[PDB]
Every structure is written in structure tokens, then in C-alpha cells.
Amino acid sequence: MFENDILVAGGDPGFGAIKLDAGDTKVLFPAVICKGNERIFSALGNGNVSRGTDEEMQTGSLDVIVTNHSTGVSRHYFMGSLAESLNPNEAHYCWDEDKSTDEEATALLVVALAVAQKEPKANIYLGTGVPVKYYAALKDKYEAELKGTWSVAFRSGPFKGQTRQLTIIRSRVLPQSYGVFIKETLNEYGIPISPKLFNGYVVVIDPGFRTTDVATFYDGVMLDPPNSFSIEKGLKWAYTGVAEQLKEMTINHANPIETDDKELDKVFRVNEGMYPWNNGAINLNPVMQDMLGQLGTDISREVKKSLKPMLGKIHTVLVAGKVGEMIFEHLQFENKVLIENPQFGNATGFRIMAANLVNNITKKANAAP
Numbered sequence: 001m002f003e004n005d006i007l008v009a010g011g012d013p014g015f016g017a018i019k020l021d022a023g024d025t026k027v028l029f030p031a032v033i034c035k036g037n038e039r040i041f042s043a044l045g046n047g048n049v050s051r052g053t054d055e056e057m058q059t060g061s062l063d064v065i066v067t068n069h070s071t072g073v074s075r076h077y078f079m080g081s082l083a084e085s086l087n088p089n090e091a092h093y094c095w096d097e098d099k100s101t102d103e104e105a106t107a108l109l110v111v112a113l114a115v116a117q118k119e120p121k122a123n124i125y126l127g128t129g130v131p132v133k134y135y136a137a138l139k140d141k142y143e144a145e146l147k148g149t150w151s152v153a154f155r156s157g158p159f160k161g162q163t164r165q166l167t168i169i170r171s172r173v174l175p176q177s178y179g180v181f182i183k184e185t186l187n188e189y190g191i192p193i194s195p196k197l198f199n200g201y202v203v204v205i206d207p208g209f210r211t212t213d214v215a216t217f218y219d220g221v222m223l224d225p226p227n228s229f230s231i232e233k234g235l236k237w238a239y240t241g242v243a244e245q246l247k248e249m250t251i252n253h254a255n256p257i258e259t260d261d262k263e264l265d266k267v268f269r270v271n272e273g274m275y276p277w278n279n280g281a282i283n284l285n286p287v288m289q290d291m292l293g294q295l296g297t298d299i300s301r302e303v304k305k306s307l308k309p310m311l312g313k314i315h316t317v318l319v320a321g322k323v324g325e326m327i328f329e330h331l332q333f334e335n336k337v338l339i340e341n342p343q344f345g346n347a348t349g350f351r352i353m354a355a356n357l358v359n360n361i362t363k364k365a366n367a368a369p
């Protein structure tokens with residue numbers, strides 16, 4: 001790695017989960033935020049058991065004050081998986097692409113970088129990616145916003161105390177699916193590794209949480225918007241279906257289940273589709289894989305609507321994101337690859353791009369900074 005521990009790090013392909021690649025270490029948690037309170041009653045030992053294997057795997061157990069050090073203002077958050085399990089009435093996914101407003105939407109990534117950073121203060125060069133259709137109209141705003149000094153104070157577990165500071169030197173922003181293509185085509189040190197991916201046509205898919213995003217790479221180049229686009233049918237649309245089916249499985253009761261997506265996401269993350277109830281369990285997995293039969297069909301049709309003129313030419317369809325593991329058997333393409341370590345595909349490519357933009361000839365000193 002580099003001769004100074006400034007983070008070269010790539011991350012926030014986040015609407016379902018912030019995820020972040022910093023080389024030998026990685027951060028991952030669901031993108032749930034709450035403007036948390038003192039935890040005063042619920043701090044009791046009554047269920048306060050830790051199950052983690054590292055400080056890294058203390059991820060998502062996050063209880064913080066975040067400070068915009070560049071402006072001297074501060075806010076208190078429960079962040080990630082903890083917030084599913086403190087304020088389930090008021091904790092929510094942050095849900096807009098724009099981060100010019102919404103310091104909340106930046107705070108998730110600020111916390112993730114502070115978890116990644118091993119030592120109390122350092123500088124960072126950042127890679128990240130907005131969803132594909134926005135890259136024509138949004139990247140410059142992130143390249144202004146997502147910069148300068150931040151700090152995080154922590155109260156839970158191995159993180160506790162330790163009021164870390166970090167400074168983003170500068171950020172490189174890319175269209176979200178491109179990170180997958182990058183991590184598949186390039187070595188750690190930016191050398192290309194298989195011309196089989198460069199020549200002819202490749203299609204690359206993040207079947208993501210808020211959105212499913214698709215880009216066509218021809219001869220090594222991402223093609224322009226009518227060939228590389230974005231689709232509102234992300235996993236959250238399937239949970240909106242599962243919620244109506246769970247409601248119609250409990251409308252027969254005197255007061256029906258009325259879950260927002262967050263509880264279904266919890267139920268698939270934590271305990272494999274068994275929604276908790278009297279007599280122990282309601283099992284959603286039949287309903288869920290009935291929905292992902294729909295969503296995988298629809299991602300295939302929403303693709304073919306814009307790509308069918310090209311369809312015969314395609315070497316392969318790359319699939320990424322957590323939902324890649326959930327949908328991949330159902331997508332209607334003859335040559336099709338689920339990329340290695342599916343979760344991080346966008347983030348890893350953003351790190352590899354950040355390494356390019358933190359050479360001395362791109363942005364570093366000749367000295368250690």
C-alpha cells in the first residue's frame with residue numbers, strides 16, 4: 001500500500017447499505033438513520049449482548065455525535081443496525097440522491113469513514129458513485145459538498161470515546177455501476193487483467209435497493225444515456241409488495257401488520273424471513289421469492305426495452321450488489337456473471353479509481369501528505 005496511511009477509500013453505493021472499501025479493511029451497514037436520544041431506559045443490560053468478531057464487525061452498532069468540523073455544527077445519531085433496534089417508529093432510510101441539502105445523507109458516509117480509519121486523525125482521498133442517470137447533472141455538487149474536515153464521537157462498544165477526525169482531500173465521483181466494471185477489469189494497482197471484458201459489448205447491473213442501475217460498456221467505454229440508465233424497480237419495490245402480501249396474510253386478524261420496508265429488511269438480514277408473531281413465526285420466504293421472481297423478470301424486461309437492439313452482441317451481463325445474490329438465477333440472459341464478493345463491487349472500483357487520483361501527478365505531495 002501507500003507509504004502514508006491517508007485513506008485511499010471507495011464507498012457509498014448506499015441506499016440499502018453504506019458500504020466502503022479501504023483495502024485490507026471494509027465497512028458495511030444498512031443505511032438507516034435516527035436523530036437519537038439519550039438511550040436512558042433502553043441502555044439496560046436486559047438484552048445488551050454483543051456478538052461481533054472484530055471492531056470492524058462492531059459495524060452498524062453505531063451511536064454517535066457527528067460534527068461538520070468545516071462549519072462548527074453537531075448532531076446526535078443512532079446509525080445503521082442499532083437504529084433498527086432503538087427507534088423503529090422514527091428511524092428511516094435516507095432517500096434522496098442530492099447531498100447539497102441533507103447533511104443526514106452525508107453523515108452515514110462520514111461515520112463509515114471514521115469506522116474505517118484506524119488511527120485518531122488522518123486525511124482521505126474518496127471514491128464514490130451517484131446512481132447512473134444522475135451523473136450528467138449531479139457529480140459536481142458532490143465534488144463540492146463531500147470534502148473537508150469531519151469528526152465523530154462514539155458511545156458504543158469497541159468504538160467508544162475515541163473522537164476521531166478525518167479530512168477528505170478531494171473526492172472522485174463516478175456513475176454507480178462503473179465501479180463493478182472497474183473492479184472486474186483492473187488489478188489493485190490499476191493494470192488491466194482480461195481484454196475479454198474490454199472488447200465488444202458488456203452490460204453491467206446493480207439490481208440495487210432504491211434503484212436498479214444498468215450501463216453498457218462497448219470496447220471498454222461506458223455508452224451514453226439511452227444505453228446506460230436507471231430503473232425505479234429496486235429491492236424496496238419488492239418489499240412494498242411483500243408488505244401488502246403480509247397485510248393480506250393478517251387482515252383476517254383484528255388489527256393487521258403494517259410494516260414499513262425497514263422491518264422486512266431487518267427480517268431478511270437478522271433471521272431469514274421469519275417475521276416474529278404469536279406461535280413464534282410467520283414465514284415470508286415463499287412470498288419473498290414469489291416477489292423476486294417478479295422483480296428479476298422485470299429487471300430483465302426493463303433492460304430489454306432499451307437494450308434489445310444490441311442484445312445479440314453482448315459478451316456477458318455482470319451482476320453486482322447484495323440483491324445480485326438474491327435475483328441472479330431469474331435474470332433472462334444467456335451469458336451472465338455474478339461478480340466476486342458481490343456487495344462491494346461499486347465501492348472496490350471506486351477505491352481503485354481513488355488510488356489513480358492520489359498519485360503525486362494527480363493529487364498528492366511528493367512528501368508523505
Ligand SMILES: Nc1ncnc2c1ncn2[C@@H]1O[C@H](COP(=O)(O)OP(=O)(O)O)[C@@H](O)[C@H]1O
Nearest residue numbers: 013014015016017208209210265269321322323
Ligand atoms: N450486513 C448485511 N447483512 C445482511 N444483509 C445486508 C447487509 N448489508 C446489506 N444487506 C442487504 O442487502 C440489500 C441492499 O443491497 P445493496 O447492494 O446494498 O443495495 P444498494 O447498493 O443499491 O444500496 C438490503 O436488503 C440490505 O439490508
Ligand SMILES: [Mg+2]
Nearest residue numbers: 206208209321
Ligand atoms: Mg446499489
